[PDB]
Amino acid sequence: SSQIRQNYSTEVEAAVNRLVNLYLRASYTYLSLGFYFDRDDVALEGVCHFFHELAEEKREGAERLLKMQNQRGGRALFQDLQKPSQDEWGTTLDAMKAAIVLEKSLNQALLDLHALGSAQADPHLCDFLESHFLDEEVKLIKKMGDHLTNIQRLVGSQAGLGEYLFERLTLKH
Amino acid sequence: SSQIRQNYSTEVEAAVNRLVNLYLRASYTYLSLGFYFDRDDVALEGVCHFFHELAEEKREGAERLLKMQNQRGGRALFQDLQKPSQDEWGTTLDAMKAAIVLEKSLNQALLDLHALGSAQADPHLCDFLESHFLDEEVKLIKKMGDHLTNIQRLVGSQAGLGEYLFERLTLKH
Amino acid sequence: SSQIRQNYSTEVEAAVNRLVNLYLRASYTYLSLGFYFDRDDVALEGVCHFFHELAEEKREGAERLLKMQNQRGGRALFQDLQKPSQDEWGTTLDAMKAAIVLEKSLNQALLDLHALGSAQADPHLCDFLESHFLDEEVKLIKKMGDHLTNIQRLVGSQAGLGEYLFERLTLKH
Amino acid sequence: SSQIRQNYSTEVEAAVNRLVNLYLRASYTYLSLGFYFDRDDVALEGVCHFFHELAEEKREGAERLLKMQNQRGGRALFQDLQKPSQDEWGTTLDAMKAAIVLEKSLNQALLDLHALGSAQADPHLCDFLESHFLDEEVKLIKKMGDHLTNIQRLVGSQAGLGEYLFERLTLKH
Ligand SMILES: [Cl-]
Ligand SMILES: [Cl-]
Ligand SMILES: [Cl-]
Ligand SMILES: [Cl-]
Ligand SMILES: [Ir+4]
Ligand SMILES: [Ir+4]
Ligand SMILES: [Ir+4]
Ligand SMILES: [Ir+4]
């Protein structure tokens, strides 16, 4: 058992394990989003790349949380990863709306865990979230909001044309 | 005559000669497609480049088959190359639909010859098709499907605009 | 829907989706194994690295399968990922025994899918597994067998000493 | 006197001076540990290096605290440095146990001062500890826990052999 654990509450340890599950589920959702945009009948490579990069970013967030759990002397506990909420993700607009819903839920989970750390007087936990998660999340939600606005400007009455141009002229290929 | 031929059926030898003719005919079809898109009254350079590169790829497939026919001790026999099925190829969409029809027919000819090789217990033939043709063909049909989807998204009610943008922003110039 | 699908059975499409789930579950199992060996009360960094690298390899196998599913015009369908079978993995020997059990099950799933592809006369599927999975799996099982033998030689009556030496002198740090 | 001091409580100023004394005492303890492992009748160079590097790290922590005390307009006050608690440090295991006791006491002193800064609404102090001390301390305690586990695995019934191997194969020389 641990000879290192100090100032690390069972409540934080459990919440950190829950947050790992949320990040892994987010990674899985993005894996599904990316491959949907790779379908021959969807074929938006920039959209595929955007979600594939987010699947890797969320897996890395989960790994940083697991590394921290061991650094503090907590014990990683894994649960089932629920499959993503959809099998098909509709338009780039539908997908970007689903992504910002998902990120808002992750952000609230970070803010909840920060509040628990503050209540528990766990400044290492609070610093860890501030340093590696809170600003990364604000920057990503701002980028998704910027994308949603541009996608929405492009619908007009020529939705196909706008979806193509957004993928060609904003997203990376 | 051959002092090398071993495990190489007359049925495979004949089918390989037929497949050479199919690949050369495909190369000819792509030659015609490329020059149609170079016409001053069509003038889509990315479309011209796309089909010109496929004419070279199909000629190279035919040459690899002929090289293999000699490696096995079979005898190349050439037939007339039928002119392509059209003199004018319509829109980029019409052309890409004709290209995927053509590739599906080539792919079926590869799968038929693989099945004959398997029936004849000719693993060298089966490996040769797996190594140099079957995945090349799946990748090319996937690319053409991706293109068809993007071309179709771009028609809307402004067909000229979509045809220009597809050629400028997806195809190479 | 797909305009590319050719010679790709619904049975193979479903089995490919099952195999993706098996590879993702294997990746998750290895994620749990790696973090267990990073615990302050286990602290075997070479063992941690060995399983962490396998988590990445299994995720990459799943992604290659998903890429192929789209290349063939099949549709990715994701299921829940079952949590790994243990929360604590015992000794390096226990862990390596669990890993070879897991790899044998993956290998049998590859051989089953190859047999289905052969029955369905799907040479692209058969080639894909031969080219990217079957030899990778044989090489990995051979490496794990080599490790198991060395770990077993090192138990003697000084189990702690042998576990340390194996991690220091065979595994990478 | 100071023309810069702003939001810097006398309680924090005094506690910062106490923490400087704790860090300097820790540096002194590590100086004694390092030279003990350099004795001709102990002769564990990796253990000597490990503690000598920690003596320098703790002196640097004290200097950063003194720099910050002046940055805030507080006044450094030095007290006697108590000699270390032992003249001889026993085995590498005894020494590593004494080191983690010492680090746990330093960590608690950091957490206490963070709590005082939070009570005093002194965010600069709180940020300073989060940025330069709290994670450095968690990482060091995790490393010492990892070492303790490896040292403990190596005792078995051949304590001399395990002590040699730990110093040769884990610690730097
Ligand atoms: Cl479900
Ligand atoms: Cl004739
Ligand atoms: Cl369960
Ligand atoms: Cl005095
Ligand atoms: Ir992609
Ligand atoms: Ir041209
Ligand atoms: Ir690790
Ligand atoms: Ir020394």
XYZ file of C-alpha atoms and ligand atoms in Angstrom:
700
model
C 0.000 0.000 0.000
C 1.047 3.742 -0.196
C 3.871 5.235 2.021
C 3.609 8.576 0.115
C -0.067 9.649 0.435
C -0.387 13.046 2.189
C -3.322 15.501 2.159
C -5.073 13.395 -0.524
C -8.747 12.765 0.374
C -10.657 9.596 -0.589
C -13.248 11.993 -2.134
C -10.630 13.530 -4.488
C -9.178 10.058 -5.297
C -12.656 8.792 -6.339
C -13.495 11.996 -8.269
C -10.135 11.755 -10.129
C -11.034 8.163 -11.146
C -14.491 9.453 -12.386
C -12.793 12.226 -14.356
C -10.427 9.677 -15.995
C -13.543 7.759 -17.120
C -15.093 11.019 -18.483
C -11.888 11.861 -20.465
C -11.613 8.290 -21.849
C -15.306 8.402 -22.844
C -14.687 11.792 -24.518
C -11.693 10.215 -26.388
C -13.967 7.379 -27.561
C -16.677 9.839 -28.716
C -14.004 11.694 -30.755
C -12.674 8.422 -32.199
C -16.258 7.716 -33.456
C -16.665 11.318 -34.761
C -13.352 11.115 -36.675
C -14.151 7.808 -38.420
C -17.692 9.025 -39.301
C -16.135 11.969 -41.252
C -13.766 9.439 -42.982
C -16.786 7.516 -44.443
C -16.805 7.532 -48.289
C -20.371 9.040 -48.097
C -19.271 11.900 -45.748
C -15.638 12.437 -46.856
C -14.621 15.628 -44.976
C -10.913 15.022 -44.230
C -10.395 18.286 -42.250
C -13.322 17.347 -39.960
C -11.904 13.797 -39.592
C -8.461 15.297 -38.586
C -10.029 17.803 -36.154
C -11.883 15.053 -34.193
C -9.023 12.503 -34.437
C -6.644 15.096 -32.837
C -9.225 15.677 -30.056
C -9.429 11.870 -29.383
C -5.656 11.911 -28.800
C -5.845 15.090 -26.613
C -8.557 13.559 -24.364
C -6.628 10.261 -24.015
C -3.535 12.305 -23.016
C -5.661 14.203 -20.379
C -6.785 10.853 -18.926
C -3.138 9.626 -18.801
C -2.017 12.843 -17.036
C -4.796 12.334 -14.429
C -3.708 8.685 -13.921
C -0.048 9.775 -13.560
C -1.121 12.358 -10.943
C -3.301 9.772 -9.081
C -0.144 7.606 -8.662
C 2.033 10.659 -7.800
C -0.385 11.354 -4.880
C -0.620 7.706 -3.765
C -4.191 7.195 -4.922
C -5.255 4.026 -6.760
C -6.519 4.050 -10.357
C -9.872 2.247 -10.706
C -11.264 1.782 -14.201
C -14.914 1.400 -15.157
C -16.554 0.385 -18.403
C -16.373 3.039 -21.129
C -19.855 3.745 -22.377
C -20.071 3.734 -26.179
C -20.629 7.185 -27.707
C -24.176 8.609 -27.710
C -24.570 8.392 -31.545
C -23.472 5.961 -34.319
C -23.863 8.705 -37.033
C -23.072 12.382 -36.321
C -25.020 14.261 -39.051
C -23.488 17.445 -40.458
C -20.227 19.200 -39.470
C -22.561 21.650 -37.638
C -24.309 18.796 -35.766
C -20.914 17.314 -34.899
C -19.411 20.661 -33.680
C -22.589 21.311 -31.524
C -22.195 17.770 -29.993
C -18.460 18.503 -29.390
C -19.112 21.772 -27.516
C -21.860 20.019 -25.406
C -19.241 17.330 -24.569
C -16.518 19.904 -23.750
C -18.930 21.969 -21.531
C -19.644 18.748 -19.555
C -15.887 18.029 -19.189
C -15.255 21.658 -18.143
C -18.012 21.440 -15.483
C -16.423 18.168 -14.195
C -13.023 20.029 -13.940
C -14.656 22.988 -12.100
C -16.486 20.558 -9.761
C -13.224 18.719 -8.941
C -11.419 22.086 -8.412
C -14.198 23.112 -5.977
C -13.799 19.748 -4.134
C -10.008 20.266 -3.959
C -10.546 23.796 -2.572
C -13.076 22.466 0.021
C -10.539 19.705 0.982
C -7.629 22.295 1.174
C -5.744 20.277 -1.524
C -3.685 22.953 -3.298
C -1.620 20.454 -5.316
C -4.882 19.150 -6.935
C -6.112 22.731 -7.523
C -2.745 23.752 -9.114
C -2.661 20.559 -11.236
C -6.080 21.368 -12.777
C -5.204 25.074 -13.270
C -1.838 24.189 -14.897
C -2.875 21.353 -17.277
C -6.713 21.465 -17.791
C -8.692 24.681 -17.058
C -7.042 26.989 -19.644
C -6.639 24.128 -22.201
C -10.410 23.625 -21.922
C -11.292 27.375 -22.175
C -9.050 27.679 -25.297
C -10.662 24.592 -26.909
C -14.257 25.781 -26.213
C -13.350 29.220 -27.671
C -11.997 27.501 -30.847
C -15.188 25.376 -31.124
C -17.372 28.469 -30.659
C -15.351 30.264 -33.387
C -15.900 27.221 -35.655
C -19.649 27.007 -34.897
C -20.052 30.703 -35.839
C -18.183 30.221 -39.153
C -20.087 26.999 -39.949
C -23.431 28.810 -39.183
C -22.490 31.821 -41.407
C -21.849 29.324 -44.261
C -25.212 27.470 -44.210
C -27.238 30.225 -45.961
C -29.367 28.243 -48.516
C -26.324 26.358 -50.035
C -25.524 23.995 -47.090
C -23.343 21.550 -49.140
C -21.212 24.372 -50.570
C -20.724 25.908 -47.092
C -19.807 22.549 -45.528
C -17.172 21.939 -48.246
C -15.676 25.462 -47.980
C -15.456 25.328 -44.167
C -13.595 22.000 -44.363
C -11.297 23.222 -47.177
C -10.529 26.785 -45.920
C -10.685 26.555 -42.069
C -9.817 22.932 -41.180
C -6.329 21.352 -41.694
C -5.648 18.884 -44.615
C 9.998 -22.483 -75.329
C 9.955 -22.184 -71.450
C 12.352 -24.233 -69.174
C 11.086 -22.298 -66.089
C 7.275 -22.793 -66.067
C 6.106 -24.515 -62.844
C 2.606 -24.603 -61.299
C 1.388 -22.042 -63.878
C -1.922 -23.136 -65.476
C -2.919 -22.315 -69.075
C -6.141 -20.873 -67.530
C -4.163 -18.368 -65.393
C -1.843 -17.531 -68.348
C -4.876 -16.687 -70.555
C -6.660 -14.760 -67.761
C -3.453 -12.733 -67.114
C -3.366 -11.811 -70.841
C -7.098 -10.733 -70.591
C -6.328 -8.642 -67.511
C -3.424 -6.918 -69.350
C -5.933 -5.980 -72.085
C -8.388 -4.655 -69.418
C -5.637 -2.500 -67.776
C -4.445 -1.151 -71.168
C -8.065 -0.346 -72.109
C -8.488 1.402 -68.727
C -5.264 3.402 -69.464
C -6.712 4.420 -72.849
C -10.048 5.467 -71.266
C -8.091 7.665 -68.801
C -5.973 9.131 -71.615
C -9.273 10.193 -73.318
C -10.723 11.523 -70.006
C -7.575 13.602 -69.336
C -7.504 15.259 -72.781
C -11.280 15.974 -72.615
C -10.692 18.041 -69.410
C -7.795 19.856 -71.232
C -10.226 21.135 -73.953
C -10.424 24.974 -74.047
C -14.256 24.620 -73.580
C -13.887 22.369 -70.465
C -10.600 23.669 -68.974
C -10.424 21.886 -65.577
C -6.664 21.323 -65.113
C -6.982 19.416 -61.781
C -9.426 16.967 -63.430
C -7.063 16.625 -66.439
C -4.130 15.817 -64.018
C -6.219 13.342 -61.979
C -7.145 11.251 -65.080
C -3.703 11.609 -66.745
C -2.067 10.167 -63.553
C -4.579 7.265 -63.633
C -3.687 6.532 -67.329
C -0.052 6.144 -66.230
C -1.015 3.993 -63.170
C -3.090 1.587 -65.330
C -0.307 1.294 -67.954
C 2.139 0.483 -65.109
C -0.307 -2.234 -63.802
C -0.389 -3.788 -67.292
C 3.456 -3.742 -67.459
C 3.719 -5.404 -64.010
C 1.313 -8.157 -65.197
C 3.393 -8.657 -68.388
C 6.619 -8.814 -66.319
C 4.992 -11.449 -64.064
C 3.702 -13.454 -67.100
C 7.353 -13.739 -68.296
C 8.634 -14.448 -64.738
C 6.254 -17.479 -64.661
C 7.092 -18.653 -68.199
C 3.754 -17.688 -69.709
C 3.529 -15.949 -73.097
C 2.145 -12.422 -73.522
C -0.588 -12.270 -76.191
C -1.955 -8.857 -77.117
C -5.394 -8.095 -78.518
C -6.835 -4.952 -80.036
C -7.522 -2.185 -77.509
C -11.117 -1.108 -77.828
C -11.494 2.677 -78.001
C -13.058 4.221 -74.882
C -16.857 4.060 -74.495
C -17.350 7.866 -74.916
C -15.748 10.661 -77.023
C -17.009 13.387 -74.568
C -17.238 12.766 -70.799
C -19.754 15.417 -69.606
C -19.231 16.943 -66.162
C -16.544 16.147 -63.547
C -19.381 14.231 -61.789
C -20.180 12.234 -64.964
C -16.471 11.522 -65.425
C -15.902 10.427 -61.762
C -19.034 8.120 -61.958
C -17.603 6.563 -65.209
C -14.195 6.164 -63.456
C -15.642 4.302 -60.445
C -17.696 2.031 -62.831
C -14.398 1.293 -64.668
C -12.462 0.650 -61.420
C -15.248 -1.663 -60.043
C -14.950 -3.715 -63.281
C -11.128 -3.898 -62.923
C -11.481 -4.862 -59.234
C -13.945 -7.662 -60.134
C -11.453 -8.910 -62.802
C -8.696 -8.965 -60.067
C -10.999 -10.847 -57.627
C -11.974 -13.310 -60.404
C -8.296 -13.985 -61.247
C -7.474 -14.375 -57.498
C -10.315 -16.937 -57.216
C -8.914 -18.801 -60.287
C -5.412 -18.774 -58.736
C -6.845 -20.140 -55.457
C -8.785 -22.876 -57.363
C -5.540 -23.743 -59.288
C -3.457 -23.750 -55.990
C -1.212 -20.986 -57.480
C -0.060 -19.074 -54.388
C 2.523 -16.985 -56.272
C -0.319 -15.554 -58.471
C -2.520 -14.982 -55.387
C 0.355 -13.206 -53.518
C 1.225 -11.126 -56.619
C -2.351 -9.752 -56.830
C -2.562 -9.166 -53.041
C 0.840 -7.379 -53.004
C 0.523 -5.094 -56.079
C -3.214 -4.776 -57.047
C -5.973 -5.567 -54.485
C -5.148 -2.869 -51.882
C -4.084 -0.333 -54.588
C -7.551 -0.813 -56.106
C -9.449 -0.555 -52.755
C -7.525 2.682 -51.927
C -8.288 4.168 -55.383
C -12.037 3.304 -55.215
C -12.187 4.852 -51.700
C -10.557 8.071 -53.064
C -13.042 8.154 -55.995
C -15.975 7.620 -53.615
C -14.658 10.471 -51.406
C -14.444 12.668 -54.542
C -17.948 11.715 -55.764
C -19.403 12.684 -52.350
C -17.628 16.083 -52.386
C -18.597 16.737 -56.029
C -22.273 15.825 -55.194
C -22.307 18.134 -52.101
C -21.130 20.984 -54.400
C -23.840 20.735 -57.110
C -26.629 22.416 -55.070
C -28.238 24.831 -57.632
C -24.865 26.480 -58.643
C -23.307 23.549 -60.612
C -20.628 25.676 -62.413
C -19.432 27.250 -59.152
C -19.231 23.822 -57.447
C -17.347 22.263 -60.377
C -14.774 25.104 -60.308
C -14.303 24.963 -56.503
C -13.881 21.165 -56.468
C -11.181 21.412 -59.155
C -9.443 24.357 -57.422
C -9.638 23.188 -53.753
C -9.548 19.331 -53.913
C -7.668 18.440 -57.129
C -3.907 19.112 -57.696
C -2.701 22.030 -59.958
C -24.662 5.308 -48.088
C -21.645 3.510 -49.761
C -20.972 3.690 -53.587
C -17.637 1.820 -53.094
C -18.556 -1.452 -51.301
C -17.544 -4.518 -53.373
C -17.034 -8.133 -52.227
C -17.399 -7.040 -48.571
C -19.819 -9.325 -46.666
C -22.051 -8.137 -43.798
C -20.477 -11.021 -41.784
C -16.936 -9.612 -42.264
C -18.161 -6.032 -41.559
C -19.688 -7.160 -38.215
C -16.653 -9.313 -37.295
C -14.320 -6.348 -38.054
C -16.406 -4.184 -35.663
C -16.099 -6.982 -32.974
C -12.339 -7.144 -33.515
C -12.067 -3.332 -33.090
C -13.833 -3.749 -29.719
C -11.398 -6.587 -28.763
C -8.328 -4.426 -29.667
C -9.710 -1.385 -27.774
C -10.434 -3.610 -24.748
C -6.873 -5.000 -24.997
C -5.564 -1.364 -25.107
C -7.581 -0.581 -21.959
C -6.261 -3.707 -20.164
C -2.689 -2.573 -20.998
C -3.424 0.983 -19.828
C -4.482 -0.532 -16.436
C -1.414 -2.860 -16.355
C 0.961 0.063 -17.058
C -0.432 2.322 -14.305
C -0.436 -0.591 -11.793
C 3.370 -0.969 -12.309
C 3.714 2.860 -11.828
C 2.198 2.611 -8.279
C 4.657 3.763 -5.556
C 4.151 0.307 -3.874
C 4.979 -1.631 -7.110
C 7.454 0.755 -8.812
C 8.767 -1.321 -11.765
C 9.328 1.328 -14.475
C 10.433 -1.160 -17.201
C 7.210 -3.164 -16.662
C 5.167 0.087 -16.742
C 6.858 1.044 -20.110
C 6.361 -2.450 -21.592
C 2.562 -2.405 -20.952
C 2.135 1.309 -21.827
C 3.759 0.631 -25.269
C 1.366 -2.330 -25.762
C -1.672 -0.074 -24.943
C -0.552 2.226 -27.777
C 0.089 -0.736 -30.173
C -3.417 -2.180 -29.561
C -5.082 1.244 -30.032
C -3.161 1.599 -33.337
C -4.409 -1.914 -34.421
C -8.000 -0.819 -33.706
C -7.479 2.402 -35.748
C -6.033 0.412 -38.694
C -9.116 -1.882 -38.605
C -11.442 1.174 -38.543
C -9.526 2.751 -41.468
C -9.900 -0.523 -43.420
C -13.652 -0.777 -42.552
C -14.133 2.671 -44.203
C -11.810 1.770 -47.135
C -14.153 -1.202 -47.865
C -17.379 0.790 -47.388
C -18.366 -0.881 -44.134
C -19.710 1.136 -41.188
C -17.889 1.380 -37.848
C -20.165 0.489 -34.908
C -18.783 0.950 -31.409
C -19.843 -0.922 -28.287
C -19.081 -0.327 -24.636
C -15.506 -1.184 -23.638
C -15.593 -3.598 -20.749
C -13.255 -2.571 -17.922
C -10.204 -4.830 -17.542
C -10.634 -8.156 -15.710
C -8.481 -7.098 -12.683
C -7.898 -3.862 -10.682
C -4.493 -5.165 -9.355
C -2.199 -7.365 -11.486
C 0.036 -9.107 -8.889
C 3.645 -9.831 -9.847
C 5.446 -9.164 -13.164
C 4.998 -12.946 -13.715
C 1.227 -12.732 -13.048
C 1.007 -9.731 -15.377
C 3.036 -11.388 -18.219
C 0.857 -14.602 -17.911
C -2.321 -12.392 -18.162
C -0.769 -10.595 -21.197
C -0.047 -13.831 -23.103
C -3.626 -15.106 -22.302
C -4.930 -11.787 -23.745
C -2.685 -11.984 -26.848
C -3.668 -15.673 -27.506
C -7.347 -14.555 -27.461
C -6.599 -11.680 -29.900
C -4.612 -14.056 -32.151
C -7.526 -16.551 -32.202
C -9.904 -13.657 -33.126
C -7.511 -12.747 -36.046
C -7.355 -16.412 -37.207
C -11.174 -16.684 -36.948
C -11.652 -13.514 -39.048
C -9.052 -14.773 -41.603
C -11.006 -18.064 -41.861
C -14.263 -16.066 -42.390
C -12.558 -13.956 -45.093
C -11.308 -17.144 -46.808
C -14.830 -18.711 -46.616
C -16.293 -15.435 -48.072
C -13.565 -15.327 -50.857
C -12.450 -11.874 -49.540
C -8.740 -11.790 -50.420
C -8.309 -8.097 -49.549
C -9.408 -8.880 -45.924
C -7.131 -11.960 -45.818
C -4.129 -9.933 -47.157
C -4.862 -7.051 -44.737
C -4.668 -9.402 -41.711
C -1.552 -11.198 -43.056
C 0.207 -7.862 -43.786
C -0.559 -5.889 -40.577
C -1.647 -8.357 -37.796
C -0.748 -12.090 -38.032
C 3.078 -11.778 -37.966
C 2.967 -8.777 -35.543
C 0.990 -11.025 -33.178
C 3.301 -14.091 -33.582
C 6.367 -11.855 -32.902
C 4.720 -10.327 -29.791
C 3.669 -13.740 -28.350
C 7.237 -15.037 -28.951
C 8.649 -11.995 -27.046
C 6.175 -12.581 -24.163
C 7.085 -16.283 -24.041
C 10.804 -15.332 -23.955
C 10.019 -12.928 -21.072
C 7.936 -15.504 -19.148
C 10.837 -18.004 -19.355
C 13.359 -15.422 -18.061
C 10.988 -14.245 -15.298
C 10.402 -17.936 -14.256
C 14.189 -18.685 -14.208
C 14.602 -15.684 -11.838
C 12.031 -16.669 -9.160
C 14.193 -19.359 -7.472
C 13.682 -18.640 -3.702
C 14.582 -14.869 -3.996
C 11.442 -13.625 -5.864
C 11.974 -9.882 -5.063
C 15.589 -9.955 -6.276
C 14.578 -11.742 -9.514
C 11.704 -9.318 -10.178
C 14.057 -6.322 -9.755
C 16.809 -7.812 -11.975
C 14.370 -8.740 -14.767
C 13.007 -5.174 -14.800
C 16.509 -3.621 -14.654
C 18.371 -5.925 -17.121
C 15.698 -7.049 -19.670
C 13.061 -4.272 -19.745
C 13.694 -0.721 -21.127
C 14.184 2.308 -18.745
C 12.398 50.307 5.592
C 10.102 48.889 2.789
C 8.219 51.183 0.278
C 7.042 48.079 -1.684
C 5.220 45.879 0.885
C 1.563 45.292 -0.117
C -0.842 42.555 1.054
C 2.034 40.787 2.871
C 1.042 39.823 6.447
C 3.499 39.701 9.374
C 2.219 36.104 9.901
C 3.287 35.056 6.363
C 6.631 36.930 6.712
C 7.423 35.013 9.950
C 6.227 31.660 8.527
C 8.404 32.210 5.403
C 11.431 32.778 7.697
C 10.538 29.487 9.575
C 10.259 27.630 6.269
C 13.706 28.945 5.186
C 15.102 27.475 8.433
C 13.325 24.125 7.713
C 14.777 23.981 4.138
C 18.302 24.889 5.360
C 18.032 22.222 8.090
C 16.869 19.715 5.438
C 19.921 20.718 3.288
C 22.196 20.097 6.292
C 20.585 16.682 6.986
C 21.231 15.730 3.323
C 24.824 16.996 3.509
C 25.336 14.600 6.495
C 23.541 11.718 4.676
C 25.716 12.186 1.557
C 29.045 12.156 3.438
C 27.948 9.109 5.514
C 27.502 7.110 2.243
C 30.997 8.353 1.125
C 32.640 6.697 4.209
C 35.173 3.975 3.228
C 33.152 1.529 5.454
C 29.810 2.357 3.706
C 30.998 3.199 0.157
C 27.712 3.493 -1.810
C 28.502 6.233 -4.367
C 24.983 6.304 -5.934
C 23.461 6.856 -2.460
C 26.073 9.578 -1.740
C 25.129 11.338 -5.076
C 21.372 11.016 -4.426
C 21.604 12.775 -1.005
C 24.241 15.326 -2.136
C 21.881 16.420 -4.995
C 19.028 16.757 -2.448
C 21.249 18.978 -0.183
C 21.700 21.322 -3.163
C 17.942 21.214 -4.051
C 16.918 22.137 -0.465
C 19.480 24.988 -0.299
C 18.075 26.297 -3.623
C 14.485 26.125 -2.153
C 15.650 28.198 0.838
C 17.280 30.771 -1.514
C 14.076 31.026 -3.609
C 12.071 31.669 -0.393
C 14.584 34.366 0.684
C 14.411 35.984 -2.790
C 10.589 36.012 -2.537
C 10.695 37.451 1.043
C 12.688 40.436 -0.356
C 10.442 40.683 -3.471
C 7.455 41.145 -1.079
C 9.260 43.585 1.243
C 9.569 41.170 4.147
C 12.801 40.870 6.151
C 14.878 37.675 6.257
C 15.622 36.571 9.841
C 17.950 33.618 10.325
C 18.015 31.242 13.279
C 20.513 28.604 14.310
C 20.471 25.488 12.119
C 19.993 22.463 14.311
C 22.473 19.683 13.518
C 20.897 16.638 11.842
C 19.069 14.106 14.044
C 21.675 11.311 13.493
C 25.499 11.112 13.104
C 25.252 7.664 11.342
C 22.343 6.784 9.017
C 22.365 2.940 8.971
C 21.382 1.194 5.739
C 20.227 2.722 2.420
C 16.730 1.608 3.575
C 17.121 3.410 6.939
C 18.383 6.500 5.112
C 15.536 6.505 2.497
C 12.912 6.059 5.341
C 14.511 9.065 7.198
C 14.449 11.066 3.906
C 10.728 10.454 3.272
C 9.945 11.368 6.964
C 11.909 14.623 6.379
C 10.159 15.356 3.046
C 6.662 14.662 4.560
C 7.482 17.250 7.283
C 8.616 19.804 4.645
C 5.483 19.099 2.560
C 3.240 19.648 5.625
C 5.084 22.970 6.299
C 4.371 24.003 2.624
C 0.668 23.011 2.947
C 0.427 24.893 6.283
C 1.945 28.054 4.735
C -0.389 27.721 1.683
C -3.375 27.494 4.080
C -2.107 30.636 5.924
C -1.721 32.469 2.584
C -5.278 31.447 1.601
C -6.632 32.607 5.023
C -4.718 35.943 4.574
C -6.020 36.323 0.917
C -2.361 36.385 -0.310
C -2.618 34.900 -3.813
C 0.976 35.767 -4.771
C 2.227 33.574 -1.840
C -0.218 30.780 -2.787
C 0.885 30.907 -6.486
C 4.586 31.014 -5.487
C 4.245 27.766 -3.475
C 2.132 26.068 -6.195
C 4.616 27.097 -8.940
C 7.975 26.268 -7.264
C 7.353 23.864 -4.290
C 4.120 21.788 -4.096
C 4.570 19.700 -7.286
C 8.396 19.504 -6.829
C 7.701 17.992 -3.396
C 4.994 15.531 -4.629
C 7.363 14.349 -7.431
C 10.261 13.884 -4.958
C 8.124 11.932 -2.418
C 6.849 9.702 -5.277
C 10.491 9.006 -6.339
C 11.454 8.194 -2.708
C 8.440 5.883 -2.351
C 9.434 4.137 -5.624
C 12.979 3.739 -4.217
C 11.766 2.435 -0.826
C 9.665 -0.236 -2.603
C 12.635 -1.364 -4.750
C 15.020 -1.341 -1.759
C 12.453 -3.416 0.279
C 11.998 -5.959 -2.590
C 15.816 -6.419 -2.589
C 16.329 -7.221 1.132
C 15.061 -10.843 0.959
C 17.677 -12.777 3.058
C 20.727 -11.352 1.113
C 20.643 -7.716 2.404
C 24.246 -6.837 1.315
C 23.673 -8.113 -2.233
C 20.385 -6.163 -2.517
C 21.953 -2.952 -1.175
C 24.796 -3.202 -3.735
C 22.454 -3.955 -6.679
C 20.072 -1.095 -5.814
C 23.001 1.352 -5.716
C 24.526 -0.032 -8.950
C 21.330 -0.485 -11.059
C 18.906 2.254 -9.825
C 21.097 5.093 -8.482
C 23.366 7.307 -10.690
C 27.218 6.808 -10.754
Cl -25.184 0.644 -24.865
Cl -6.888 -8.851 -84.834
Cl -18.133 -4.262 -14.641
Cl 20.967 32.695 18.924
Ir -8.962 10.868 -41.233
Ir -3.502 18.376 -68.483
Ir 5.413 4.541 -16.567
Ir 29.924 11.374 -3.106
